[PDB]
Structures are given as C-alpha cells and as structure tokens.
Write a protein that binds this ligand. Structure first.
Ligand code: ANP
Ligand code: ANP
Ligand code: LE0
Ligand code: LE0
Ligand code: MG
Ligand code: MG
Ligand code: MG
Ligand code: MG
Ligand code: MG
Lengths: 278, 275
C-alpha cells in the first residue's frame, strides 16, 4: 500500500490475474494517476489476449494441456521400463491408518470421507504400494510402476493448492543399486519429459515420510521423493526395499506455461488450457 | 446334455479366467464339476502367464490407451478436450431433475450438504459448452473422459467408479441426429468395435436415449436436443451428445469376462488378476 513507489493494488492484481497470464506485481509508478492509467491498459491487454486465446483454441482444438503433459511423462516412463497402473479413487479407512494418517494427524483433517469406512484418496502411495507388492510375487526382477490421477484434499485455499489435483506417483520396488542415484535419474526423466529440465533438490520435513527430497523451481515445490518407509506393510515383518516420487502435474504445467494462478491448467468449469471461458 | 456351470462356479471361473464359461453344457453334475476343476486350473495358469508377460514388456495401461485412441480420433474431428471437476453441486444435479424425491437420488455419493461426486458428465459439459458458445458462432464440439461415481448393485457390467467419455456438439451443421450417428461411428471405430447397434431406450433423466449396444450390452447412451433439460442450462439450440462407458468398451473388445478387469483396480491389471 505504498504511496511513494506505487504498485498495482491487491485488487488490481487479482483482476489482472483473472484473465491475464503476465507478471504484474513488479510494476512501479510515480503516482496513483500513473498506476491507474497503466492498469487500464494492462487490463485491456489481458482481457483481449484471453479472448484471442479461447477463440483460437475453439477453432483449433488440441488434446487438453494436462492430458498431453500426462502422456509425455507416461511415454517417457514406459520407455524406462515402468508399468502404468490405474487404481481406485476410493480407499479404506484401514489403508489411511496404515500410513499413520490417523485421527491425530494434520493430513487427517484434510480427508474427504465417503462413508464410515472409505474416503477419497489424498495420495497415491497406499494403492501403489499394494499393487507393487503383489506384482513382486510374479517376478524376480525389480518392479517399476507409476500412476497419474486425481487425489483430493481439504485445503486452506492458498497459493498453489486445489481441492482436487492430479498427482503423478512413480515407484520402484525390489533389488537396489545406489538407490538415490537411481531415484534422481527418474526425477530427471520426468522433469525433462515435462519440459522443465532446470530444478533444485531441497530436503524438506514431512510428517508422513519423516524426511523427503523435494523438487523446487524458484522455491515452489512440485514433487516429493523418498526412499520408502515400511509402516504401510504392517502385515509383514520383512519388507521389500522401494522408493518413489510424487509430482504435482497442475503445478508443473502452471510453471511451464507461466499461468498466473494454479486454477487455470487442470480440471475446471471456469478455465480451459490457461484461458478463462466466462 | 443340459447341465451348466452354476453361478458360483461361473464367478470362480471368471475371477482368473477370461474364457466364455456360460456356454458349456454337461451330461450330469459329475461331468460339470470335473470340467470346472480343469477349467479353473487352466484359467489360473493362463492368468499367471499373462501377468508375467506384462512385467516383461511394460506398457501404457489398457484403459489409458483406449482413452488416447478415442481422444485422438475426436481431436481429429475438431473436438475440444476439456477436463472438469469431479465435484458438482446439489443444484447442478437438480437441474438434471435428480432431486430428493426421485429414486435416482439415492445412487449419488455425497461429499457435503451441497456437493456430490458427479454420477455423469452432462452437468459440467452443459456448463462448458454453453460458455464456449459465447465465443463462437460455429458448432461447439467438446468431450471429456473422467471418473464418475454411482452407488450400484452387483458388478453386472457395473462399477462404483467408472470412466465415462462424453462428447457433445452444440449447434451442429446438419441434422443433430445424423451428426450424432457419425460421431458415435468415429468413437466406436477408434475403439476397435466397428460392429454395434443403435437402439432407442428409456431414461429417467432424459426420458429417451439412443443407446449403443453390442450383443445387447449397453455401452453408450446418447441424446439429441432441443431437449426439456436445456432450459435449466440456458441452452436454446439443437445439440447432440453421447456418453460412453470406457471400461465396458474395453471389456467387450478384449473379451474380458467381467467389467472389473480392464479399469482402475488393486486386484486386476489389464485383464489379469495380480493377487
Ligand atoms: N492441494 C494440492 N494442489 C495441487 N497440487 C498439490 C496439492 N497437494 C499436493 N500437490 C502436489 O502433489 C505433490 C505431493 O506431495 P505432498 O507431500 O503430499 O504435498 P505437500 O507436501 O503437502 N505440498 P504443499 O502442500 O504445497 O506443501 C506435491 O509435491 C505437489 O506438487
Ligand atoms: N456403474 C457403471 N459402471 C460402468 N459403466 C457404467 C456404469 N454406469 C454407466 N456406465 C456407462 O456409462 C454410459 C453412460 O451412462 P448412463 O447411460 O447414464 O448409464 P446407464 O443408463 O444407467 N447404464 P445401465 O446401468 O447398464 O442401465 C452407459 O452407457 C454405460 O456404458
Ligand atoms: O504421501 C505423499 O506424501 C505423496 C507423495 C509421495 C512420496 C513418496 C513416494 C510416493 C509414491 F510411491 F506413491 F510414488 C508418493 C503420495 O503418497 O502420493
Ligand atoms: O453423462 C450423462 O449425463 C449421460 C450421457 C450423455 C447423454 C447426452 C449428452 C451428454 C453430454 F452432454 F455430456 F455430452 C452425455 C449419461 O448417460 O449419464
Ligand atoms: Mg499440503
Ligand atoms: Mg511434500
Ligand atoms: Mg444404471
Ligand atoms: Mg440404461
Ligand atoms: Mg444409459
């Protein structure tokens, strides 16, 4: 709210980001009159750019941006020997408690319950671990699998959070080499296939995996990876070694396409491929 | 020879097996049960081979691949692929005439007092196609593939979560029914199922649909406007739309014995049982 180095107001920024995918919060003006004259021209550009974009998209449709991204990453993983799997969106109360997501946990508040014993999955690891364990019964080789699909969380409506988002989870179980070097190679395969070859690996605290490697771009988390802990497999004393990585595909797409909010590239009845339709 | 496998035997055979067990006939119970024993063994042995073969040649998932084949075929017809939220409002369901009095209301999974898991794609596609009509004079051609949810009975071609492909063309160039029949043909050929029948059927939502059936099995329900549900969605022009059950299509094309094997699962992967 500085009246000396005058920026666009907070309201003006939301109005600009509604239709525009430029960058707006850095502009500085001499006075209010110059801020507001610039806002007028910026807002007009943003809205006309949006209308051109949606008209060209209607006239020349492609696969959806999120589906295309999923396909690029999936074909890359399959070429590295990963099996694509699809698991149910419902998961049982039992599976959630087996991840130590229990009545006392921070993530437990965020769970959507469907009935007394089942919920919408907030993560992919529970189902993926089960499928991976069963596939290990049929082979002496390592098992590498991945899934892409919707997970659901109750969220604080902050910067890069959706209640429904599309996660990619990849996992590798069985005989290991240098586990972390293999995992880092997988992340690189995914990140290059996504079109985001430049990123940082930062270690972040976690209540579920204890310690994770995060993937960050300009300080924004797009992925957590881990060498697998063994609390999910409570029914066996002896566990298989495994590791995995979970990527936020809407976050990847948003960063790559430089959309101004995370609501624009995924599932929506207000946005289609970055453009506002109403 | 009039003795057949019992229903319990059929379900046991189909658990691991993808043959056509319901055709077999036997002289007496002894021969039925001796055949059952052999068929169960073959089914389990064949299944183990299949799952090892998948591990040896990893691939895209069979459902995802079918989705991509149909979706690329529809893009090639000028359709816009959209993705819409799995959550829809109680009001959106009411505008489809899915209201508290109606029996259909009880198949809906509720999230909160005013939000539900979508049991169908038309509520969101209605909303998007109407908005896109604000930007063009031409046909608005869109489609979505995504999970839908219904409380059901036994798994007779029925899942609780299934994948629907719904397409819609609002304000088509040509008779809306003729255009629909052409787009259904595009989908079915792209799915590898060029032989099918169009059959007019009743619906508690649409009152009348054109269904796609293969050997009497419903794989699609379609509808043509102007339609009585159009007013509540601010639609005032001809349109045609169709919703396909992608797991049903995949099951029929691959000859899987149940609809549980080709879709999302923690027990099945591409037609084979993993546990
Ligand atoms: N609500 C959400 N909306 C969009 N993407 C999400 C959401 N939650 C998680 N993701 C993405 O999915 C990945 C899964 O990691 P996970 O550790 O479960 O989330 P997280 O640690 O809570 N990330 P954050 O909530 O931003 O701090 C993350 O790296 C994100 O890229
Ligand atoms: N529970 C389900 N499991 C799998 N596919 C389904 C299910 N319900 C509907 N579908 C598929 O989705 C398509 C469009 O939905 P809709 O026409 O509303 O289903 P429906 O008329 O209730 N089918 P049915 O239950 O066999 O009488 C159907 O033609 C089926 O192919
Ligand atoms: O719980 C979570 O923090 C997420 C992210 C995650 C971290 C490690 C390994 C995986 C895996 F195996 F599914 F791919 C996933 C989730 O489980 O989806
Ligand atoms: O999804 C539904 O509502 C229907 C399928 C359907 C019939 C007509 C038009 C559409 C449309 F508009 F989405 F494309 C979809 C159902 O069978 O459930
Ligand atoms: Mg979080
Ligand atoms: Mg994280
Ligand atoms: Mg039904
Ligand atoms: Mg029917
Ligand atoms: Mg029907």
């Amino acid at each position: 709210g500085s009246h000396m180095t005058v920026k666009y107001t907070d309201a003006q920024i939301q109005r600009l980001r509604e239709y525009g995918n430029g960058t707006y919060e850095q502009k500085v003006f001499e006075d209010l009159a110059s801020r507001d004259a610039a806002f007028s021209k910026e807002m007009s550009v943003a809205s006309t750019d949006n209308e051109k974009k949606i008209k060209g998209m209607i006239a020349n449709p492609s696969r959806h941006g999120l589906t295309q991204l999923m396909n690029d990453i999936a074909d890359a993983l399959v070429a590295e020997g990963f099996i694509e799997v699809r698991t149910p969106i419902f998961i049982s109360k039992d599976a959630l408690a087996r991840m130590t997501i229990t009545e006392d946990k921070p993530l437990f508040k965020q769970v959507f319950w469907i009935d007394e014993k089942r919920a919408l999955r907030p993560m992919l690891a529970p189902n993926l671990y089960s499928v991976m364990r069963d596939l290990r019964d049929h082979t002496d080789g390592p098992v590498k699998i991945f899934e892409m699909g919707s997970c659901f969380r109750k969220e604080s409506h902050s910067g890069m959070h959706l209640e429904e988002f599309t996660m990619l989870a990849l996992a590798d179980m069985g005989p290991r080499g240098d586990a972390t070097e293999v995992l880092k190679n997988y992340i690189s395969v995914v990140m290059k296939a996504a079109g985001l070859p430049d990123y940082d690996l930062v270690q972040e605290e976690s209540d579920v995996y204890k310690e994770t490697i995060d993937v960050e771009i300009n300080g924004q988390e797009v992925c957590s990876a881990a060498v697998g802990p063994h609390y999910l497999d409570a029914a066996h004393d002896v566990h298989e070694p495994w590791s995995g990585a979970g990527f936020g595909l809407e976050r990847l797409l948003t960063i790559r396409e430089k959309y101004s909010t995370v609501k624009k590239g995924g599932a929506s009845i207000s946005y289609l491929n970055g453009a506002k339709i109403n």
